[PDB]
Specification:
Oligomer: part of a larger assembly
CATH superfamily of chain G: Aminohydrolase, N-terminal nucleophile (Ntn) domain
Shape of chain B: globular
Family (chain A): Belongs to the peptidase T1A family.
Largest sheet of chain G: 7 strands, antiparallel
InterPro entries (chain A): Ntn_hydrolases_N, Proteasome_alpha, Proteasome_alpha-type, Proteasome_asu_N, Proteasome_sua/b
Number of domains of chain G: 1
Order of helices and strands of chain B: EEEEEEHHEEEHHEE
Chains: A alpha+beta (250), B alpha+beta (204), C alpha+beta (206), D alpha+beta (243), E alpha+beta (196), F alpha+beta (241), G alpha+beta (232), H alpha+beta (231), I alpha+beta (226)
Structural class of chain B: alpha+beta
GO biological process, one term (chain A): proteasomal ubiquitin-independent protein catabolic process
CATH architecture of chain B: 4-Layer Sandwich
Number of helices of chain G: 7
Radius of gyration of chain B: 16 Å
Number of strands of chain G: 12
Structural class of chain G: alpha+beta
Strand order of the largest sheet of chain B: 9-1-2-10-11
Helix content of chain B: 25-40%
GO cellular component, one term (chain A): nucleus
CATH class of chain G: Alpha Beta
Number of strands of chain B: 11
Keywords (chain A): Cytoplasm, Isopeptide bond, Nucleus, Proteasome, Ubl conjugation
Chain lengths: 250, 204, 206, 243, 196, 241, 232, 231, 226
């Protein structure tokens, strides 16, 4: 063959610009808005699903993917890119930290690992950056609850609150104004519903709005009963019915 | 014959009230030539303590392997490697040479500083976790220690009641084993201080 | 075809240095003011963070100061993304040496190494250079404290006081004046902070 | 407009200009025809003898694969041999694994996919041939034609070259006069008829007729070239009609 | 260890024992050595159990590709896939497999692949260390192209002897009727023919 | 210029190449429709065979990935054949590793992941075809997943492809709102085939013969195609309605 | 390495002026259980060569595939080239020797004993031996396995030197082979009743006669000679 | 134009420009003409030398007892293709006891030329070779074109001013085929041909090189007082 | 070492001793032989205990990946197959013996797998060096269509027969019950029989009975300022 694409194609410009990283943000903006609010006793993350035909089962498309039972992920930007990364995350976590240390990674560590893949993929030629920006919300014993934004440049940064997507800027000013140090999960939920409505004109109903949490303990879904001090899944996607009840308190 | 018995020697570990203690003989030989009385089998990386039995050259290599891995752990995660995590890392590593295995027997000791749980662990060549909090023993005279330790020990021993118990337990058995003796070190590990005590005893 | 995009990406300008290096220099400089001051009895590392909000949690964030070991630290000026890679490499490389000789590696060999990785990307391959300048602060008994800066050109030099990022010019001036041989840790802290108070492109210094 | 400078890549047309020009070279090539017969298949080809200093019946382009496959080609001559050689290594592997002469639908896949691997990329250029191939196996008559594009189906009859227009119209007449399909032995006189009529399109330089066939049992489930007496008959019958 | 495939008029019937021993201990006596790999081709397993399990899973996958791309494997076609693997990996894999199937067109066919591995088409085949006894009985009392009922009876009769003479052999006669009607599993308790 | 041809980022966001994959689809002009029975999954396709030069029977749009999973393709013929080979390999490999046939959904996901790889890599290109996997999985019953050249995918309870799908898509929405039922729930396989064919006839506005249809039917653990003669009988039932 | 599983006992042969006669028992013996009967072990390739193979049935069929490849490779491209540069027995013999060579140096033999019998385009009698020990030599009479030790001296009684090839005719050779198959059967335990016989002339081609059976065993001494020693 | 740099990209016409230039190179080089009868093949080639000081350079090289080639066009590329053939001749001969046929050898070079036009950044060889041989099937002369077309021919000529040779070849076509059993007369006919092809730079005793292989003629190159005979 | 598994109508029951042994030296008087590949596939090891612990972990990782990816509960068949292959790669050097018991969407399952990689279906199966004492009890008590209640009984009894016979057995007897579609109930320490005779008299030393050369505070925390 010969493939002459090894050479960087994210080459500097005369003003130091990184052409492909700048363009990737464009795909992010066409995303449907997602947001994350961190409280003292958990994390809530929220989004509206991508539009689809009614005829299509809307259960299948899910923008919130469980990556480990303790760490969930939600994105804004392209759909195709997200999937490949999600497999890749589950993969690298088992091989390198669940065979060695027998445990799902620490939350900052998983973010560090994803970030390298994004750095090579933008450094190296012939592979365009991922066109997605992630919010990885997780828990770990060592750093407590955490929320991190992962950019396609592969920089990752902790935020009290943030939003990515269409209306990321507007939503950030909103979230700042309602951020408190007495926040609860419940207070946070309230805010997320206000934010989401302002930024999305779509219909608000439990079958197309995702609300998913890092924080409820589940001895119940532990899947086994035999030592309850195990934390079990932190992740829970709220069930439709429950969601509907809280839309009374939109 | 056995690679373990070139230097032989023993390591003993027990748990006490919010303490552990780990001790060992200082004897190092190459067969019937006693070389050194200054050799240490017990090393420390933070609050995780590791006495290693068996083939002397394999001990120095294992220490080094693990010198590297434990520091890289401390730097990236910004925290000492728990006894808990460490035991796992130990088990994976022994496994690495599945066949032609490592000829060494690690014994872990430490205090999970994050909860206050006394912790000790054992291992074989292939590496499996041998969990038993009352005691873990190892080496060429592991047989001898077992009788002694089970009888001396009474569940939940006071910090310095634990000190009498470990010290005697080692002393009696070690002279009565030809690949053990030549003094001892007794590490009394409590949460807020670690004391290191060379013990007066017959070198014979 | 496939040869239409390629055009001898890695070729010297008439001067003797790739255009690309310059451009990468431009990028690093966007980053805030970083000061390292070498003294008889220690080194002061201080840096002012830019490209930042208070909404972004700054009580945990890292874009400056990373621990390489006890005696050796960096201050980063450049892409957090380009930096992350190097800090990892520098850590494993130091660790290998530590294990091999059970003596800390010298500072001079640490710097030389990282520098070759840089050179690699422009010598061949056509890969754009890595936009990082690090302030290396170290101690060994051989030379005392040692203070280096290193460039994306992969050059490195010895310094007694230096700045990279914004207002490197204005900061360098004051420092030379203030540098003395009887200088201690405690003076360097005050000195740096007064330099920083003036070079700030932020509202204030916080 | 830059898709004409980039080998096999999607475009607003969808079909790349390179894949399109490869068809143009096939078209300048010699007439090639294929008849699906009742109990076999007959491949015939116009071989244009530019000069008399070509050795008759020695430049032959009927390439054998296995003991039952005949293939014949128009287009770029290097591209034609390389696909057949490559097909032989593949076929040999299948017969080893499964100890069976390769089926025609089987072999059809071997040939097609080699082309596809080179349309996916722009590093590697794809074939510019249409190859008429087929023979008799346990599943019956099979007459195929593969494009430089990489699309194939069965054919009651296939045609390509400058005189493909002559070929195609008479091929349809044959299905009309024979809806049960004209038999393998009678078809050999007809094939020669079509070639001659097709020679009017290609009349500037002389031809030499060259026929082969694979048949269930007329050849005795073998591959043979139509030669001697049979060849001779087919010469007379053909001439006699264009006169 | 008693396994056979025996052709008849309308196809072919497989019969096998179930008792599988490790040592003098009967390891498992509900084993199913008649095994599925394609709808109408099944396989009789004998020899080291491990080696035979592993190969059956690898060929199976191949068979599924065969169907999809090159049409249904014949019994001949399938047998050939076993022959290859066991020849090349003679020492590693010691596996003696009878591969037998019913085509509609070509009728019941029996092919046996040795440890060494080499195809034989044979009208019928009999194998196993506990089934030595019934080489004499079987050959002598073979009636070619049996009635279907006669083919069932025939295997039952032979197997009464084989269990008598051999302790390793024992348990239910597990059977697969490979006919146009497809796959019919039959089971016959050992008690009915050992005592009677 | 360059950013169009290779699969690096365009200033818009969307690759020129993925859009080009859809336009190319439109040029075959062959329209496929998928609905679900209670117990079956029915595919009918237009079948075009213009002259006798090309043999009728060989024209196909159906590929048997395994003994159970059918696939209908909408779009170019070479590309379909290529994608078809890969999918057969995947399905098998999953049997080898796991001891059972790949579910319809899992299979679709795998292809979408591949699709992604072709749109990052510069010399690789996204396929011009659209892959619609159908099955009736044992456990879960009827299964429709449609996979795109992007690799964007979702499940369905009925879908239609071809350049003239727009008509079919609205007619399907209207029919299924009225009935209410999400999908045809007739137990009988024969009824769902009559319904599918009749519905197409309304939607496109153009009547068909047996010759103009090609009918695939999937039930549990099995894919099979209905013979010509059965399809004639199916038309007698339609004429009678 | 290779441990013998299933094997054939013997292939027997000689020369005469217009060709060669090669015959062989047809048998796959698996230990002392004679598991496969009537495994044919002569493979005609064309009408000018027959390859008679003894040893492993396992390896014999692996060699068969290669035999298949040999014909196709010749037939490939122009037919008129390989008409008049047809596969001689020499071409097949060489091809084979090479494959074996490689395998056994790496300590994994292709475990067979072969006699390649034919007549050239020239018609020259070609008879040569190649086996798994890599020993390769031509001889007027040849046989492998048991048949070397037993059958072969009869054949050798008739043709002794290279000057006795013209003198022998086809008729004489055939009677000689036959007489020897009888003896052979009598005195070999691992013999099959069933045997095939091949005559290759460069004037009539191959006549293959299959499924001949051995003639009545001689039993004159079975009914007189009793006991085994002192005791009865 | 634009299809001259690229090899992977088909010209609109569908005939690559590199291949048109490769053919161009054949024309600038030495005249060489080949012919065959039934019992022999005969090659005539013009030896070249840069200057008076330069000794004349043989262009026909004996490859094997049954094979040899002449080159017309670039000399460097000829060397690659010719080494290749020696290896293949010998390999085949060792394995099968079967001499590499002329017909088969031709396909090998062909598939090889294909790979470098397929692959982006390769180049066709800028050279033609007339490969002659005598084997049991008969005498032969094969034409290797850099276009990948292999043809058996009674006679052909390539090189500069090939035209004199070409009219001579048609004319003498039937005559040289019934000449057999005489090498000497066949070789004379070739000399007649080459001197028509030349205008200026007359042949002398070492400007001429001849090769002949035949039934009873091992592949021999004739030069000096040997070709004095046939002048 | 005694393990029994007995499949029943409503789920599949695994039970095992907790005395773990390395030679006639009891390594751990009590330590669960019951281990988890996953909450719906529990397993126990016989043979080289070391080998078992490891291989469950390694393979069990792959299974989690498959499990997430198919978006189904861990499948008994998927795990079993994977393991078979891995052993086979070494030709069964791995000294592993596992009872692979679990629930999945297709019902309740029990299988064996041996060091060479032999597998068998069983309505009841047994592994260990006390496999033979345990198995006797089952075949007698057994009837068609055990209930949940009955399956507890047979499992407890069979391990209890092994205490008297096999020496490696002894101490606590644990049971776990894996029900279809339902959380796995660990009845850890299902039986607790009496171990360890209370001390006849002290052996605890008076103070001052040891002789100590020196003591020194040795730091272990990261260096801190004064």
């Amino acid at each position: 063959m010969t493939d002459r694409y090894s050479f960087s194609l994210t080459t500097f410009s005369p003003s130091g610009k990184l052409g492909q990283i700048d363009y990737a943000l464009t795909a992010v903006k066409q995303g449907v808005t997602s947001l994350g609010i961190k409280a003292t006793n958990g994390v809530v993350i929220a989004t509206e699903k991508k539009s689809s035909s009614p005829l299509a089962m809307s259960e299948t498309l899910s923008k919130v993917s469980l990556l480990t039972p303790d760490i969930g992920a939600v994105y804004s930007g392209m759909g195709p890119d997200y999937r490949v990364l999600v497999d890749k995350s589950r993969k690298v976590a088992h091989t390198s930290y669940k065979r060695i240390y027998g445990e799902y990674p620490p939350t900052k560590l998983l973010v560090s690992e994803v970030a390298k893949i994004m750095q090579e993929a933008t450094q190296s030629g012939g592979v365009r950056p991922f066109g997605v920006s992630l919010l990885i919300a997780g828990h770990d014993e060592f750093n407590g609850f955490s929320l991190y934004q992962v950019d396609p440049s592969g920089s990752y940064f902790p935020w009290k609150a943030t939003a990515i997507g269409k209306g990321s800027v507007a939503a950030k000013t909103f979230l700042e104004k309602r951020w408190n140090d007495e926040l609860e999960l419940e207070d946070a939920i309230h805010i997320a519903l206000l934010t989401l409505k302002e930024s999305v004109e779509g219909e608000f109903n439990g079958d197309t709005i995702e609300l998913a949490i890092i924080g409820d303990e589940n001895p119940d879904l532990l899947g086994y009963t035999g030592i309850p001090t195990d934390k079990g899944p932190r992740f829970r996607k709220l069930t439709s019915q429950e969601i509907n009840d809280r839309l009374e308190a939109l | 014959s056995d690679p373990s018995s070139i230097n032989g020697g023993i390591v003993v570990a027990m748990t006490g009230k919010d303490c552990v203690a780990i001790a060992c003989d200082l004897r190092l030989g190459s067969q019937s030539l006693g070389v050194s009385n200054k050799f240490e089998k017990i090393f420390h990386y933070g609050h995780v303590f590791l006495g290693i039995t068996g083939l002397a050259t394999d001990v120095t290599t294992l220490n080094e392997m693990f010198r590297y891995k434990t520091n890289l752990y401390k730097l990236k995660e910004e925290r000492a490697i728990e006894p808990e995590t460490f035991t796992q890392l130990v088990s994976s590593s022994l496994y690495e040479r599945r066949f032609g295995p490592y000829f060494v027997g690690p014994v872990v000791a430490g205090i999970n500083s994050k909860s206050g749980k006394p912790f000790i662990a054992g291992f074989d060549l292939i590496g499996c976790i041998d969990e038993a909090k009352d005691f873990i023993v190892s080496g060429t005279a592991s047989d001898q220690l077992f009788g002694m330790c089970e009888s001396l020990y009474e569940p939940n021993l006071e910090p310095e009641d634990l000190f009498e118990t470990i010290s005697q337990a080692l002393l009696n058995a070690a002279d009565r084993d030809a690949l053990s003796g030549w003094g001892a070190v007794v590490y009394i590990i409590k949460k807020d201080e670690v004391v290191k005590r060379y013990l007066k005893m017959r070198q014979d | 075809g496939s040869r239409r995009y390629d055009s001898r990406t890695t070729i010297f300008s008439p001067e003797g240095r790739l255009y690309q290096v310059e451009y990468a220099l431009e990028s690093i400089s966007h980053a805030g003011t970083a000061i390292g001051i070498m003294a008889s009895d220690g080194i002061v590392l201080a840096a002012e963070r830019k490209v930042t909000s208070t909404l972004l949690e700054q009580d945990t964030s890292t874009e400056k100061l990373y621990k390489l070991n006890d005696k050796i630290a960096v201050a980063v000026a450049g892409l957090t993304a380009d930096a992350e890679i190097l800090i990892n490499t520098a850590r494993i490389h130091a660790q290998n040496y530590l294990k091999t000789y059970n003596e800390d590696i010298p500072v001079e060999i640490l710097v030389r190494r990282l520098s070759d990785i840089k050179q690699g990307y422009t010598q061949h391959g056509g890969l754009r250079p890595f936009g990082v300048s690090f302030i290396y602060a170290g101690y060994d008994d051989r030379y005392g404290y040692q203070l280096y800066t290193s460039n994306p050109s992969g050059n490195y030099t010895g310094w007694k006081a230096i700045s990279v990022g914004a207002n490197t010019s204005a900061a360098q001036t004051l420092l030379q004046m203030d540098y003395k041989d009887d200088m201690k840790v405690d003076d360097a802290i005050e000195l740096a902070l007064k330099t920083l108070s003036k070079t700030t492109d932020s509202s204030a210094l916080t | 407009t830059g898709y004409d400078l980039s080998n096999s890549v999607f475009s607003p047309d969808g079909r790349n200009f390179q894949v399109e020009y490869a068809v143009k070279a096939v078209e300048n090539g010699t007439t090639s025809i294929g008849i699906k017969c009742n109990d076999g298949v007959v491949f015939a080809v116009e071989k244009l003898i530019t000069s008399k200093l070509l050795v008759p019946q020695k430049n032959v382009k009927i390439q054998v694969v296995d003991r039952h496959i005949g293939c014949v080609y128009s287009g770029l001559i290097p591209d034609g041999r390389h696909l057949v050689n490559r097909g032989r290594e593949e076929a040999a592997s299948f017969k080893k694994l499964y100890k069976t002469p390769i089926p025609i639908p089987a072999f059809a896949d071997r040939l097609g996919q080699y082309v596809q691997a080179h349309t996916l990329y722009n590093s590697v250029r794809p074939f510019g041939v249409s190859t008429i191939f087929g023979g008799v196996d346990k599943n019956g008559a099979h007459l195929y034609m593969l494009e430089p594009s990489g699309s194939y189906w069965g054919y009651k009859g296939a045609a390509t070259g400058k005189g493909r227009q002559s070929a195609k119209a008479e091929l349809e007449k044959l299905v009309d006069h024979h809806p049960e399909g004209l038999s393998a032995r009678e078809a050999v006189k007809q094939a020669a008829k079509i070639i001659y009529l097709a020679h009017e399109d290609n009349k500037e330089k002389d031809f030499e007729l060259e026929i082969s066939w694979c048949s269930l049992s007329e050849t005795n489930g073998l591959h043979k070239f139509v030669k001697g007496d049979l060849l001779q008959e087919a010469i007379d019958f053909a001439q006699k009609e264009i006169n | 260890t008693s396994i056979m495939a025996v052709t008849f008029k309308d196809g072919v019937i497989l019969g096998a024992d179930s008792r599988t021993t490790t040592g003098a201990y009967i390891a498992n006596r509900v084993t199913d050595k008649l095994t599925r790999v394609h709808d109408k081709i099944w396989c009789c397993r004998s020899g080291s159990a491990a080696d035979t399990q592993a190969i059956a899973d690898i060929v199976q996958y191949h068979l599924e590709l065969y169907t999809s791309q090159y049409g249904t494997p014949s019994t001949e076609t399938a047998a050939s896939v076993f022959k290859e693997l066991c020849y090349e990996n003679k020492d590693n894999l010691t596996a003696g497999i009878i591969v037998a199937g019913y085509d509609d067109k070509n009728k019941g066919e029996v092919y046996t692949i040795p440890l060494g591995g080499s195809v034989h088409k044979l009208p019928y085949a009999i194998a196993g260390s506990g089934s030595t006894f019934i080489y004499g009985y079987c050959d002598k009392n073979f009636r070619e192209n049996m009635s279907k009922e006669e083919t069932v009876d025939f295997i039952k009769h032979s197997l009464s002897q084989a269990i008598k003479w051999d302790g390793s052999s024992g348990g239910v006669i597990r059977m697969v009727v490979l006919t146009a009607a497809g796959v019919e599993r039959l089971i016959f308790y050992p008690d009915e023919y050992e005592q009677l | 210029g360059y950013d169009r041809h290779i699969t690096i980022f365009s200033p818009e966001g969307r690759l020129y190449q993925v859009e080009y994959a859809f336009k190319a689809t439109n040029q075959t002009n062959i329209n496929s429709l998928a609905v679900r029975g209670k117990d079956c999954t029915v595919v009918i396709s237009q079948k075009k065979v213009p002259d006798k030069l090309l043999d009728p029977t060989t024209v196909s749009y159906i590929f048997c990935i395994s003994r159970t999973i059918g696939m209908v393709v909408n779009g170019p013929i070479p590309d379909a054949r290529n994608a078809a080979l890969r999918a057969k390999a995947e399905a098998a490999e999953f049997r080898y590793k796991y001891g059972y046939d790949m579910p319809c959904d899992v299979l679709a996901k795998r292809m979408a992941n591949l699709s992604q790889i072709y749109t990052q890599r510069a010399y690789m290109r996204p396929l011009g075809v659209i892959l619609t996997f159908v099955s009736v999985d044992e456990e879960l019953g009827p299964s429709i997943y449609k996979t795109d050249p992007a690799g964007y995918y979702v499940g369905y309870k009925a879908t239609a492809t071809g350049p003239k799908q727009q008509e079919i898509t609205t007619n399907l929405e209207n029919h299924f709102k009225k009935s209410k039922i999400d999908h045809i729930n007739e137990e009988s396989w024969e009824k769902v085939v009559e319904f599918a064919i009749t519905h197409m006839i309304d939607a496109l506005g153009t009547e068909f013969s047996k010759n103009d249809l090609e009918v695939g039917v999937a039930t549990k653990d099995k894919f099979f195609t209905l013979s010509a003669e059965n399809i004639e009988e199916r038309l007698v039932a339609i004429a009678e309605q | 390495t290779q441990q013998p599983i299933v094997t054939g006992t013997s292939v027997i042969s000689m020369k005469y002026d217009n060709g060669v006669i090669i015959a062989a028992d047809n048998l796959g013996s698996y230990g002392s259980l004679l598991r496969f009967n009537g495994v044919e072990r002569l493979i005609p390739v064309g009408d000018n060569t027959v390859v008679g193979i003894s040893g492993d049935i396992s390896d014999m069929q692996h060699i068969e595939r290669l035999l298949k490849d040999l014909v196709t490779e010749n037939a490939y491209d122009n037919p008129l080239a390989d008409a008049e540069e047809a596969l001689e027995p020499s071409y097949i013999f060489e091809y084979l020797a090479t494959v074996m060579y490689q395998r056994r140096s790496k300590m994994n033999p292709l475990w067979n004993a072969i006699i390649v019998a034919g007549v050239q385009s020239n018609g020259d009698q070609f008879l040569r031996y190649v086996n798994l020990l890599g020993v390769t030599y031509s001889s007027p009479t040849l046989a492998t396995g048991f048949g070397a030790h037993m059958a072969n001296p009869l054949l050798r009684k008739v043709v002794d030197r290279e000057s006795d090839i013209p003198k022998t005719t086809v008729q004489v050779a055939e009677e000689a082979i036959v007489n020897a198959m009888r003896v052979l059967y009598y005195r070999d335990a691992r013999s099959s009743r069933n045997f095939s016989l091949a005559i290759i002339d460069k004037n009539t081609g191959l006549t293959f006669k299959k499924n001949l059976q051995v003639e009545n065993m001689k039993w004159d001494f079975a009914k007189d000679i009793k006991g085994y020693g002192t005791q009865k | 134009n634009n299809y001259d740099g690229d090899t992977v990209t088909f010209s609109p016409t569908g005939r690559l420009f590199q291949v048109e230039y490769a053919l161009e190179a054949i024309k600038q080089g030495s005249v060489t003409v080949g012919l065959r009868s039934n019992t022999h093949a005969v090659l005539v080639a013009l030896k070249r030398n840069a200057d008076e000081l330069s000794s004349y350079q043989k262009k026909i090289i004996k490859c094997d007892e049954h094979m040899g080639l002449s080159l017309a066009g670039l000399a460097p590329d000829a060397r690659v293709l010719s080494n290749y053939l020696r290896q293949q001749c010998n390999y085949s001969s060792l394995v099968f006891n079967r001499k590499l046929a002329v017909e088969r050898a031709g396909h090998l070079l062909c598939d090889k030329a294909q790979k470098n036009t397929q692959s982006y950044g390769g180049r066709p060889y800028g050279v033609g070779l007339l490969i002659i041989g005598y084997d049991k099937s008969g005498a032969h002369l094969l034409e290797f074109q850099p276009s990948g077309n292999v043809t058996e021919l009674y006679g052909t000529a390539i090189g500069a001013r090939s035209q004199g040779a070409k009219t001579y070849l048609e004319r003498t076509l039937d005559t040289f085929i019934k000449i057999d059993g005489n090498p000497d007369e066949l070789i004379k006919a070739g000399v007649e041909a080459i001197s028509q092809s030349l205008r200026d730079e007359s042949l002398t005793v070492d400007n001429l090189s001849i090769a002949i292989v035949g039934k009873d003629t091992p592949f021999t190159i004739y030069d000096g007082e040997a070709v004095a005979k046939y002048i | 070492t005694t393990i029994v598994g007995v499949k029943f109508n409503n789920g599949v029951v695994i039970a095992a001793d907790t005395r773990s042994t390395q030679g006639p030296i009891v390594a751990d008087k009590n330590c669960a032989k019951l281990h988890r590949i996953s909450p719906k596939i529990w397993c126990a090891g016989a043979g080289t205990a070391a080998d078992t612990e490891a291989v469950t972990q390694l393979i069990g990782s792959n299974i989690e990946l498959h499990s997430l990816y198919t978006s189904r509960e861990p499948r008994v068949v998927s795990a079993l197959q994977m393991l078979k292959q891995h052993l086979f790669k070494y030709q069964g050097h791995i000294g592993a013996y596992l009872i692979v018991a679990g629930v999945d969407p297709t019902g309740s399952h029990l299988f064996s797998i041996h060091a060479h990689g032999s597998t068998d279906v069983g309505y009841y199966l047994s592994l260990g060096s006390g496999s033979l004492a345990a198995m006797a009890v089952l075949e007698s008590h057994w009837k068609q269509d055990l209930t949940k209640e009955e399956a507890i009984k047979l499992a407890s009894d069979a391990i209890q027969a092994g205490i008297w016979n096999d020496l490696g057995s002894g101490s606590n007897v644990d049971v776990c019950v894996m029900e279809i579609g339902k959380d796995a109930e660990y009845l850890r320490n299902y039986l607790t029989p009496n171990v360890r005779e209370e001390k006849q008299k002290s052996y605890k030393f008076p103070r001052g009975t040891t002789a100590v050369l020196k003591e020194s505070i040795v730091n272990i925390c990261d260096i801190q300022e004064e």
